[PDB]
Design an enzyme around this catalytic site. Sequence first.
Site, mmCIF file in Angstrom:
data_model
loop_
_atom_site.group_PDB
_atom_site.id
_atom_site.type_symbol
_atom_site.label_atom_id
_atom_site.label_comp_id
_atom_site.label_asym_id
_atom_site.label_seq_id
_atom_site.Cartn_x
_atom_site.Cartn_y
_atom_site.Cartn_z
ATOM 1 C CB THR A 152 -30.992 5.199 -18.396
ATOM 2 O OG1 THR A 152 -30.027 4.340 -17.480
ATOM 3 C CG2 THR A 152 -32.179 4.629 -18.487
ATOM 4 C CG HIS A 207 -28.793 2.835 -24.034
ATOM 5 N ND1 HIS A 207 -28.220 2.556 -22.460
ATOM 6 C CD2 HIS A 207 -27.828 2.903 -24.645
ATOM 7 C CE1 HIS A 207 -27.066 2.526 -22.781
ATOM 8 N NE2 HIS A 207 -26.724 2.602 -24.026
ATOM 9 C CG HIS A 224 -33.390 9.319 -14.441
ATOM 10 N ND1 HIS A 224 -32.305 9.859 -13.884
ATOM 11 C CD2 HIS A 224 -32.951 8.310 -15.431
ATOM 12 C CE1 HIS A 224 -31.041 8.764 -14.457
ATOM 13 N NE2 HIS A 224 -31.876 8.109 -15.256
ATOM 14 C CD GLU A 225 -28.348 12.280 -15.305
ATOM 15 O OE1 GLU A 225 -28.035 13.570 -15.763
ATOM 16 O OE2 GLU A 225 -28.002 11.434 -15.297
ATOM 17 C CB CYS A 245 -37.110 -6.961 0.064
ATOM 18 S SG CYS A 245 -36.136 -5.630 -0.338
ATOM 19 C CB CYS A 249 -35.656 -2.392 2.224
ATOM 20 S SG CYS A 249 -35.976 -1.840 0.617
ATOM 21 C CG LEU A 268 -20.658 2.683 -12.148
ATOM 22 C CD1 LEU A 268 -21.523 2.391 -10.939
ATOM 23 C CD2 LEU A 268 -20.483 4.180 -12.661
ATOM 24 N N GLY A 269 -19.073 0.270 -14.700
ATOM 25 C CA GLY A 269 -19.387 -0.148 -15.897
ATOM 26 C C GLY A 269 -20.091 -1.387 -16.098
ATOM 27 C CG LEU A 270 -23.774 -2.051 -16.016
ATOM 28 C CD1 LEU A 270 -24.879 -1.224 -16.056
ATOM 29 C CD2 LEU A 270 -23.838 -3.450 -15.142
HETATM 30 N N1 LIG Z 1 -25.540 1.007 -11.750
HETATM 31 C C1 LIG Z 1 -24.553 0.961 -12.296
HETATM 32 O O1 LIG Z 1 -23.514 -0.242 -12.321
HETATM 33 C C2 LIG Z 1 -24.287 1.979 -13.563
HETATM 34 C C3 LIG Z 1 -24.921 3.378 -13.320
HETATM 35 C C4 LIG Z 1 -24.518 4.369 -14.038
HETATM 36 C C5 LIG Z 1 -23.757 3.735 -15.353
HETATM 37 N N2 LIG Z 1 -23.397 2.695 -15.505
HETATM 38 C C6 LIG Z 1 -22.474 2.160 -16.606
HETATM 39 O O2 LIG Z 1 -21.253 3.134 -16.328
HETATM 40 C C7 LIG Z 1 -20.606 2.925 -17.668
HETATM 41 C C8 LIG Z 1 -20.242 4.271 -18.007
HETATM 42 O O3 LIG Z 1 -21.369 4.984 -18.134
HETATM 43 P P1 LIG Z 1 -21.197 6.342 -19.004
HETATM 44 O O4 LIG Z 1 -22.606 6.939 -19.426
HETATM 45 O O5 LIG Z 1 -20.091 7.247 -18.766
HETATM 46 O O6 LIG Z 1 -21.089 5.518 -20.711
HETATM 47 P P2 LIG Z 1 -20.273 5.921 -21.908
HETATM 48 O O7 LIG Z 1 -20.580 4.909 -22.828
HETATM 49 O O8 LIG Z 1 -20.603 7.401 -22.209
HETATM 50 O O9 LIG Z 1 -18.769 5.947 -21.535
HETATM 51 C C9 LIG Z 1 -17.835 4.809 -21.414
HETATM 52 C C10 LIG Z 1 -16.412 5.301 -22.097
HETATM 53 O O10 LIG Z 1 -15.733 4.125 -21.952
HETATM 54 C C11 LIG Z 1 -14.804 4.141 -23.219
HETATM 55 N N3 LIG Z 1 -14.071 3.030 -23.465
HETATM 56 C C12 LIG Z 1 -14.465 1.906 -24.526
HETATM 57 N N4 LIG Z 1 -13.530 0.824 -24.452
HETATM 58 C C13 LIG Z 1 -12.735 1.387 -23.526
HETATM 59 C C14 LIG Z 1 -11.494 0.612 -23.045
HETATM 60 N N5 LIG Z 1 -11.186 -0.543 -23.457
HETATM 61 N N6 LIG Z 1 -10.695 1.111 -22.014
HETATM 62 C C15 LIG Z 1 -10.862 2.427 -21.743
HETATM 63 N N7 LIG Z 1 -12.197 3.023 -21.981
HETATM 64 C C16 LIG Z 1 -12.918 2.406 -22.915
HETATM 65 C C17 LIG Z 1 -15.475 4.885 -24.170
HETATM 66 O O11 LIG Z 1 -14.841 5.453 -25.242
HETATM 67 C C18 LIG Z 1 -16.556 5.691 -23.496
HETATM 68 O O12 LIG Z 1 -16.005 7.171 -23.390
HETATM 69 C C19 LIG Z 1 -21.801 2.217 -18.819
HETATM 70 O O13 LIG Z 1 -21.131 0.956 -18.574
HETATM 71 C C20 LIG Z 1 -22.880 2.427 -18.134
HETATM 72 O O14 LIG Z 1 -23.658 1.340 -18.641
HETATM 73 C C21 LIG Z 1 -23.691 1.621 -14.595
HETATM 74 ZN ZN LIG Z 2 -37.130 -3.436 -0.841
#
Ligand SMILES: NC(=O)c1ccc[n+]([C@@H]2O[C@H](COP(=O)([O-])OP(=O)(O)OC[C@H]3O[C@@H](n4cnc5c(N)ncnc54)[C@H](O)[C@@H]3O)[C@@H](O)[C@H]2O)c1
Ligand SMILES: [Zn+2]
Length: 346
Positions: A42, A45, A65-66, A98, A101, A264-266
Amino acid sequence: EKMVAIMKTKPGYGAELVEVDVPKPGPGEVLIKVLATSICGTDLHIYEWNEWAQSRIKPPQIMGHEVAGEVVEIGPGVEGIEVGDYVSVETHIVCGKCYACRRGQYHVCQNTKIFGVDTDGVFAEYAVVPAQNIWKNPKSIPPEYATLQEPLGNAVDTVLAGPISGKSVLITGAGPLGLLGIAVAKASGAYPVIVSEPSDFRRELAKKVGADYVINPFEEDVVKEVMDITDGNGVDVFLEFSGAPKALEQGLQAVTPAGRVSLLGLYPGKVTIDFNNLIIFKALTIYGITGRHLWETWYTVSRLLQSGKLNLDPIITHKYKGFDKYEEAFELMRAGKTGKVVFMLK
Ligand SMILES: NC(=O)c1ccc[n+]([C@@H]2O[C@H](COP(=O)([O-])OP(=O)(O)OC[C@H]3O[C@@H](n4cnc5c(N)ncnc54)[C@H](O)[C@@H]3O)[C@@H](O)[C@H]2O)c1
Ligand SMILES: [Zn+2]
């Protein structure tokens, strides 16, 4: 009265290191002295000033923030926190009002504000924090580990969304969140933990942290390798830590029928998925993961830290003394050359 801060002063790329007045804690606030602080995707970005940060950040604002810190001042009305307390910070500031919560699902509060995104952060010598977002740390946990508790909590909630001990696991993504997932999964008894990651540097970190098998999905057929490892049955558990659309499709192919998925990933946008064959006909359980469960996830994280079973040293690839090298820190991250970066403060 003055302190160094890393500051997003105006729209555009980068940040400035400035000296500003130490904030004063008002009602329901405390002031902490920062001991260690770490950089989140974050933060990257916001530094890069992508579209998201453009829509969300009002300069000027202190970044970060960490945190691991020490309470040095209490605002009026604050109870239950004392000067000298060792603390970290939960970033979701929830409304308490809400439907989410009131059902205890604070992590998806319908009126959520994010500390260090909607507010000044912690890349500074001191920070003001809402008292209800303060987490007391046991003193045994070193600041360099305590500062990782937020992303470590995300990793806990992804890994532990269901049973994991003695379960086979595929993790896609070994950026910092995935690496922390590996550490959590291994400390919680998962085996084999299979990790797919195209970066050579991060894939080797995944092995040092404790992956049982690693796969480069840009050179190897992920699903076929996973079938080999699991004798054709697929993995019990699939944890998506990359945000790559192709990794989501592979994990839904590789997971055993009636297995469990945590996301988790976005992704860069909408994803196109075979729901019939991969989710429905496989009868999957799928959990979307965001934030941390307040406060159970923090208790779990804290005990796992105290147990010494998380293999976190390989993940901390860069420990900086103060903030002077922040430009280099952010550029190394952008390059993918990092696990986690920690700023250590005197
Ligand atoms: N609230 C949430 O859902 C939340 C909270 C924290 C982080 N995130 C998300 O979690 C994800 C991970 O965060 P991060 O800081 O570790 O991100 P980062 O981008 O550092 O790492 C993502 C990793 O994915 C790898 N990757 C790319 N393509 C791939 C493939 N096809 N197969 C396997 N690996 C692949 C990249 O090489 C990279 O090392 C991100 O999408 C981030 O946005 C979401
Ligand atoms: Zn709330």
